[PDB]
RNA sequence: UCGGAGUACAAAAAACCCUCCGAGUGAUUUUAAUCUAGACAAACCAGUCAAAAUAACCAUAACAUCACUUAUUGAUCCAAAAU
């Protein structure tokens, strides 16, 4: 027959992002006792030191996917007083744009009760949502 | 006939269900407000 | 159990087993959970589901019921619209 | 302080009853329960007293 | 499908645009049944599927309603890729 | 006499599956009265503090750090009273999944 | 089973086949005292009938 | 029985006695920071990462790329401090920060990020997506030079291809435009590789557009070894990865073994191994640019399968493993009536002899 | 009759007319569903958990919560209920 018709019906997709994009990947259900819950594929982590503000998107193994930091010269030279609410909003906007470039659209954010009621991170979340990045990662198919 | 009567009664009782639940909620709110007002009046008369 | 009756000399059966049990043709016996109608307001929903659910009997109780029941109740039964007709037989028993 | 066992039926027209423990010195019982016949959040009111 | 003369032309076009996922490269629409062990019941299911397809392609009152749970992700990714698509520079 | 009611059967509170045991989803890994082993990856927590595997794989036991929920007032207070170098450690039970999620099989070559 | 009976000649399709004919051909056995009400038809071998 | 610990205990440093003179942290955030700092250390006991795949821990990655730009650190720091001081001297910026009404030039931010620290972020995301795990299997590089790839949807619609983006085959049907900064003294090679989609060989990948001997920026005037082929992913197995790799070369490389014909519609010839390709051209080529994107199945893939490739469209499906059931017992004890349904072959009544 | 501690020091079980605490319920609203893998425990009867999927509320949780939370409870048959 046609040489191109060979299929090998057991197809192997080596892309690690494949199952996460189809939302059939294995979420890390579990602990329940410790915090935060590690049932996700990507997680937003905001670190607010006394000088700089650093927003990470981390995979469940702990590596850094995309980060937006006030320590970076691009935001440092364009923004004054990198500790403000405006600094958090700018970091959130930059991170949302970088996530759109990276092709990631869903992530989880689990702030503390005193952190979710703050002004800087409320506007950070608002900027992240307005930038196209939506939280509440979709439910796993056949969880 | 029994099936139609059951369906008719179910529809009739469901047509007033929002009104009944709103009335119950308002009654409970009124009772709580009355108890709170009585306690506030007692505290105000006892503090003087 | 009357092993030898007085009138016909046959082997009688106890009516309690047939009243509160069901025998499948595969040899299994069917029974209800004890206490599924007593004090439902005091029990959890999962416990009530377990009480309402049917259960089987092991080898010892199955042999006891077989001894206590006559072979008439061990016959093959073809009822009309029988719910347990699908459970009458056994499949994929690798023993 | 003695409790009371009260049987409450649905207000959705369908016949659906369930039992609840209550305090004797309280008012008539009225709650929002779940009715599986209509599969809805239904107001349930007290009608009968079963056990003390 | 194109040689099926027992259905109207608009119905054939609607079938071709809707059920193009099961149309072979030769244009032969293919239906499959697997549920029952009896070929009689399998053909009954195939014919029922064909009847449903004919009805849904012939009824002009079809609003083409779609679900939301399985399509929210597609809508969000489409919007987010359109955000990047909004670049307007002439090329080629 | 004076001491009554002291008879009560043991509740069989213990560890069921050890490290290296191949289990399936729903298998109870361990049961306990107080929090002795905490669930980790792919291990649920029943309302009676029992631990059951959520995925099919190999059971492992690891010593890990303890970061409690901010809503749990007692644990939060203990954490704030901990000295500057102290970090709580606990023993967690994990299940390493062995079976892949699925395989891409050919259905029809259309 | 009906096909087996017909092709082994126990019952003949040329004549009308009744429960009497099935009993005579030993295709089925009916015990009226056991509340049996006759013979029902199933579709176990409808593919090769 | 007691055993000696195999190394230092976690909380053996601080003194138990005189706790009131030892400072405490009163912040759950401080404790969380300390706990996550400690959790990343290589402890001697069985930890979570060892059992859940830290990917062999430390790996000495072979670096195949251009040297980093040599920048005067002292003068760079002086200029950055001067720019920061000049920005701080302004009073309107302080007023905007206080009043919470301040904006950022995101375009300039993106340009500066690409210029200074974009290569590292792109490299780490390519790690995360496994580009180096399948292209060289042991080697990571830093995408020093930028690479802006863009598909044209029409007259006024341009779809960019960023690191990890999702571009449909309808958008990727035509050849894209590639832009990068380079002087008119160097030679470049662009290679579009499909990592996933090979039907037969799992350890092999496809080529879609290979152009070599690119003088400077001008990609059109460079000779194309393999003509452009629109992406063709499978309907079932979706989200394949397509990577544009840009290599800088020194000599004028000519090859007759990797040359592809003008039609090039044979998948047997369209079978590639970037490892062997870089082994063959290791002396001159050095990777400097990389841009990968995801691609799923759409209606345009059927046309590519039928008209161009002259094959039937293969359709896949994500099948799940069958549920596990224990060995069926002769007499199940306290099992539900549905216990027999878990081992039923089919939901069809079977009459053996009747 | 049931639960907790030591006896019974480290997986489980383990007795005495052995040494001590108790339980035969209260308070509040989040009134807490159906179905079904797989498991704990157990002579039997009983007791326990529970992934996925469905109905109603955030479109992100629902195990009712607290009192050392573990015990706060009783099998058939039969009577009253009326689904
Ligand atoms: Mg004891
Ligand atoms: Mg005992
Ligand atoms: Mg018979
Ligand atoms: Mg420096
Ligand atoms: Mg056991
Ligand atoms: Mg569930």
């Amino acid at each position: 027959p046609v040489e191109n018709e060979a299929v090998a019906p057991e197809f192997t997709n080596r892309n690690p992002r494949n199952l996460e994009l189809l939302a059939v990947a294995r979420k890390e259900r579990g602990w329940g006792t410790v915090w935060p819950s590690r049932e996700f594929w990507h997680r937003l982590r905001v670190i607010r030191t006394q000088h700089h503000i650093e927003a990470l998107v981390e995979h469940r193994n702990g590596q850094v996917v995309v980060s937006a930091s006030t320590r970076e010269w691009a935001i440092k030279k364009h923004l004054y007083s990198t500790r403000n609410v405006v600094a958090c909003e700018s970091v959130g906007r930059v991170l949302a744009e970088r996530c759109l470039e990276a092709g990631i659209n869903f992530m989880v954010y689990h702030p503390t009760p005193w952190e979710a009621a703050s002004d800087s991170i409320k506007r950070l979340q608002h900027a992240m949502t307005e930038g196209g990045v939506v939280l509440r990662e979709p439910r796993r198919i056949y969880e | 006939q029994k099936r139609q009567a059951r369906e008719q009664l179910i529809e009739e009782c469901m047509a007033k269900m929002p009104q009944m639940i709103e009335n119950w909620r308002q009654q409970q709110q009124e009772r709580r407000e009355k108890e709170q007002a009585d306690k506030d009046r007692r505290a105000r008369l006892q503090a003087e | 159990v009357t092993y030898f009756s007085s009138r016909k000399g046959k082997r009688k059966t106890v009516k309690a087993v047939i009243y509160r049990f069901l025998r499948l043709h595969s040899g299994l016996w069917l029974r209800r959970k004890a206490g599924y109608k007593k004090k439902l307001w005091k029990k959890t929903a999962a416990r009530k589901r377990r009480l309402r659910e049917f259960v089987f009997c092991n080898k010892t109780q199955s042999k006891l019921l077989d001894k206590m029941t006559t072979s008439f109740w061990k016959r093959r039964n073809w009822y009309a619209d029988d719910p347990y007709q699908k459970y009458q037989d056994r499949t994929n028993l690798k023993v | 302080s003695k409790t009371i066992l009260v049987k409450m039926m649905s207000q959705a027209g369908t016949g659906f009853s369930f039992n609840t423990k209550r305090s004797r010195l309280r008012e008539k019982l009225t709650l929002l329960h779940y009715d599986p016949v209509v599969k809805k959040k239904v107001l349930f009111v007290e009608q009968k007293k079963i056990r003390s | 499908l194109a040689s099926a003369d027992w259905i109207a032309e608009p119905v054939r076009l609607k079938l071709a645009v809707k059920h193009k996922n099961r149309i072979n490269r030769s244009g032969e629409l293919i239906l499959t049944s697997e549920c029952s062990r009896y070929q009689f019941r399998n053909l009954a299911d195939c014919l029922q599927k064909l009847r449903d397809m004919i009805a849904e392609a012939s009824q002009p009152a079809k609003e083409p309603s779609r679900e939301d749970a399985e399509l929210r992700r597609s809508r969000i990714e489409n919007m987010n890729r359109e955000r990047l698509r909004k670049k307007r520079i002439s090329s080629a | 006499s004076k001491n009554l009611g002291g008879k009560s059967p043991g509740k069989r509170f213990g560890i069921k599956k050890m490290e290296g045991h191949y289990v399936h989803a729903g298998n109870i890994l361990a049961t306990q009265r107080h929090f002795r082993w905490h669930p980790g990856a792919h291990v649920g927590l029943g309302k009676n503090k029992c631990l059951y595997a959520l995925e099919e794989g190999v059971v492992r036991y690891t010593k890990e750090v303890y970061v409690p929920n901010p809503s749990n007032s007692e644990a939060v207070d203990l954490v704030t009273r901990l000295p500057q170098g102290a970090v709580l450690y606990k023993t967690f039970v994990h299940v390493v999944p062995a079976k892949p999620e699925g395989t891409f099989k050919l259905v029809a070559m259309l | 089973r009906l096909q087996y009976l017909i092709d082994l000649g126990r019952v003949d399709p040329t004549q009308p086949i009744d429960l009497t004919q099935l009993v005579n051909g030993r295709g089925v056995t009916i015990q009226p005292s056991k509340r049996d009400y006759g013979v029902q038809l199933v579709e176990e071998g409808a593919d090769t009938f | 029985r007691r055993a000696a610990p195999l190394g230092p205990m976690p909380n053996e440093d601080i003194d138990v006695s005189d706790l009131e003179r030892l400072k405490k942290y009163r912040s759950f955030d401080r404790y969380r920071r300390r706990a996550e700092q400690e959790a990343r250390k290589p402890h001697w006991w069985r930890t979570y990462r060892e059992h859940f795949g830290e990917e062999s821990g430390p790996k000495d990655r072979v670096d195949i790329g251009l040297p980093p730009p040599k920048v005067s650190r002292t003068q760079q720091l002086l200029e950055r401090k001067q720019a920061l001081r000049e920005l701080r001297a302004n009073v309107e910026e302080e007023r905007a920060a206080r009043l919470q009404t301040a904006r950022i030039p995101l375009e300039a931010v993106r340009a500066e990020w690409e210029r200074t620290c974009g290569p590292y972020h792109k490299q780490r995301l390519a790690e995360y997506c496994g580009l180096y795990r399948d292209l060289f299997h042991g080697a990571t590089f830093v995408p020093r030079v930028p690479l802006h790839v863009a598909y044209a949807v029409g007259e006024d619609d341009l779809m960019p291809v960023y690191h990890g983006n999702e571009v449909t085959p309808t958008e990727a049907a035509q050849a894209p435009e590639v832009t990068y900064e380079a002087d008119e003294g160097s030679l470049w090679t662009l290679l579009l590789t499909n990592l996933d989609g090979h039907l037969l060989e799992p350890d092999a990948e496809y080529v879609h557009w290979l152009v070599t001997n690119i003088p400077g920026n001008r990609v059109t005037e460079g000779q194309e070894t393999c003509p452009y082929l629109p992406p063709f992913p499978a309907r079932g197995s979706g989200f394949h990865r397509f990577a544009f790799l840009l290599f800088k070369q020194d000599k004028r490389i000519d090859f007759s073994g990797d040359t592809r014909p003008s039609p090039c519609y044979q998948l047997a010839q369209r079978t590639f191994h970037t490892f062997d390709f870089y082994k063959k051209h290791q002396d001159a080529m050095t990777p400097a640019g990389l841009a990968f994107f995801q691609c799923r199945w759409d209606d345009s893939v059927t046309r590519v399968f039928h008209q161009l490739l002259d094959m039937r469209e293969p359709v896949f499906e994500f099948v799940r493993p069958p549920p596990y059931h224990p060995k069926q017992k002769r007499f199940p004890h306290r099992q539900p009536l549905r216990y027999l349904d878990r081992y039923r072959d089919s939901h069809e009544p079977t009459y053996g002899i009747y």
Side-chain angles (χ1 to χ4, degrees), chain A residues 2-22 24 28 31 35-36 38 41-43 45-49 58-69 72-81 84-86 89-90 93-94 97-98 100-105 110 112 114-115 119 123 140-142, chain H residues 28-29 32-33 36 40 48-49 52-53 55 79-81 83-84 87-88 93-94 96-97 100-106 108-110 112-113 115-117 121 124-125 128-130 133-134 162-166 194-200 202-205 236-241 265-268 294 296 309-312 314 316 318 320:
Chain A
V2 177
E3 271 195 80
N4 304 7
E5 292 294 330
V7 298
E10 179 206 70
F11 182 72
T12 81
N13 204 323
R14 302 161 330 191
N15 176 259
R17 296 292 301 275
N18 187 16
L19 299 174
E20 281 106 310
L21 287 178
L22 282 71
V24 293
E28 187 146 350
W31 285 262
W35 188 81
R38 303 195 68 257
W41 302 307
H42 307 87
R43 193 201 40 171
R45 173 101 180 80
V46 179
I47 288 165
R48 292 174 52 196
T49 53
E58 298 186 6
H59 183 227
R60 54 211 211 260
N61 44 34
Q63 64 213 0
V64 187
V65 165
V66 287
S67 66
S69 44
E72 272 163 49
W73 182 232
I75 320 176
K76 207 172 186 178
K77 68 181 178 67
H78 284 285
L79 179 85
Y80 181 76
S81 75
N84 296 115
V85 174
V86 301
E89 192 175 16
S90 159
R93 293 199 313 163
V94 170
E97 183 158 20
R98 290 178 183 178
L100 261 53
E101 291 146 80
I104 302 183
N105 314 267
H110 289 151
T112 76
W114 55 85
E115 182 174 0
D119 291 331
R123 289 157 68 82
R140 169 186 170 183
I141 302 316
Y142 277 80
Chain H
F28 176 77
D29 294 327
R32 191 162 180 252
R33 222 191 301 286
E36 293 179 353
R40 263 83 71 90
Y48 161 77
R49 321 172 73 186
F52 271 77
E55 293 107 344
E79 288 138 30
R80 286 180 172 178
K81 283 298 182 179
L84 278 183
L87 171 73
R88 297 195 275 229
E93 261 290 342
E94 192 272 331
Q100 314 210 60
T101 76
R103 288 298 186 180
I104 301 298
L106 294 172
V109 158
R110 147 90 172 186
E112 210 278 335
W113 165 77
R115 204 184 73 255
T116 184
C117 59
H121 289 197
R124 72 177 173 188
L125 194 85
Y128 166 61
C129 294
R133 201 264 314 275
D134 302 327
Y162 298 141
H163 64 99
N165 216 357
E166 174 181 356
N194 197 334
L195 291 96
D196 291 331
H198 195 178
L199 321 183
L200 275 192
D203 293 308
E205 57 190 0
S237 63
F239 287 114
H240 303 181
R241 29 178 170 177
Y265 291 107
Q266 292 294 323
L267 298 187
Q294 319 276 345
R296 68 187 316 176
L309 294 174
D310 189 358
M311 65 183 73
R312 298 177 254 173
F316 291 86
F318 184 74
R320 306 184 161 297

Side-chain angles (χ1 to χ4, degrees), chain B residues 6 9-11 13-14 17 20-21 24-25 27-28 31-32, chain D residues 11-15 27 30-32 37-38 40-43:
Chain B
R6 193 86 289 181
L9 212 53
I10 287 180
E11 181 67 29
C13 274
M14 269 314 264
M17 191 55 107
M20 283 185 59
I21 65 179
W24 175 78
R25 283 189 160 240
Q27 193 194 350
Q28 211 73 7
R31 284 302 281 150
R32 298 313 107 179
Chain D
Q11 279 282 343
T14 187
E27 61 174 2
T30 312
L31 281 83
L32 281 179
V37 176
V38 298
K40 264 273 183 284
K41 195 93 201 93
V42 170
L43 188 82

Side-chain angles (χ1 to χ4, degrees), chain F residues 30-78:
Chain F
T31 177
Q32 53 199 348
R33 184 201 320 288
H34 297 302
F35 266 100
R36 176 174 176 186
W37 314 282
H38 298 254
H42 306 301
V43 177
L45 188 153
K47 55 196 190 70
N48 51 333
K49 304 191 219 64
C50 80
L51 317 176
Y52 60 97
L54 295 161
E55 322 283 349
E56 167 179 339
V58 179
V59 183
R60 302 293 186 179
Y61 281 92
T62 65
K63 307 291 188 180
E64 290 191 49
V65 296
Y66 184 67
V67 186
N69 199 230
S71 87
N72 196 226
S73 57
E74 181 216 21
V76 167
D77 297 353
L78 165 69

Side-chain angles (χ1 to χ4, degrees), chain C residues 29 57-67, chain H residues 331 333:
Chain C
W29 283 79
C57 317
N58 68 335
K59 203 174 151 273
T60 300
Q61 288 140 160
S62 299
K63 289 178 55 183
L64 181 73
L65 301 186
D66 292 5
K67 285 185 178 183
Chain H
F331 280 101
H333 194 26

Side-chain angles (χ1 to χ4, degrees), chain D residues 10-43:
Chain D
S10 175
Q11 279 282 343
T14 187
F16 187 78
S17 68
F18 79 117
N19 310 319
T20 304
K21 217 70 174 181
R22 202 202 64 182
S23 76
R24 176 155 292 183
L25 296 199
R26 218 173 185 178
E27 61 174 2
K28 279 73 176 175
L29 212 48
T30 312
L31 281 83
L32 281 179
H33 189 281
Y34 178 80
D35 201 84
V37 176
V38 298
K39 292 181 181 179
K40 264 273 183 284
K41 195 93 201 93
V42 170
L43 188 82

Side-chain angles (χ1 to χ4, degrees), chain E residues 1-61 64 69 71-92:
Chain E
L1 192 71
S3 311
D5 50 334
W6 50 294
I7 62 170
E9 191 52 273
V11 176
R12 184 186 314 169
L13 271 193
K14 287 193 177 184
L15 283 181
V17 65
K18 288 185 179 181
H19 303 283
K20 54 172 141 193
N21 45 307
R22 53 220 310 171
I23 297 169
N24 200 18
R25 187 196 40 161
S26 296
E28 291 136 30
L29 180 61
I30 300 177
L31 303 192
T32 315
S33 197
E34 184 69 22
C35 63
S36 166
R37 67 155 75 254
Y38 303 117
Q39 44 203 50
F40 284 20
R41 285 203 176 104
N42 296 323
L43 276 296
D45 193 15
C46 284
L47 296 192
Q48 193 61 33
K49 288 180 181 181
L50 202 43
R51 289 171 196 264
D52 303 317
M53 293 180 183
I54 291 302
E56 67 184 1
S58 88
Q59 205 46 257
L71 290 88
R72 281 177 296 174
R73 318 190 291 104
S74 51
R75 183 160 30 248
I76 294 286
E77 74 186 21
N78 196 340
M79 290 156 107
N80 289 28
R81 72 169 176 259
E82 181 197 59
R83 264 181 161 111
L84 279 75
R85 190 169 162 180
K86 294 288 101 175
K87 310 174 53 153
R88 293 189 49 130
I89 297 89
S90 162
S91 46

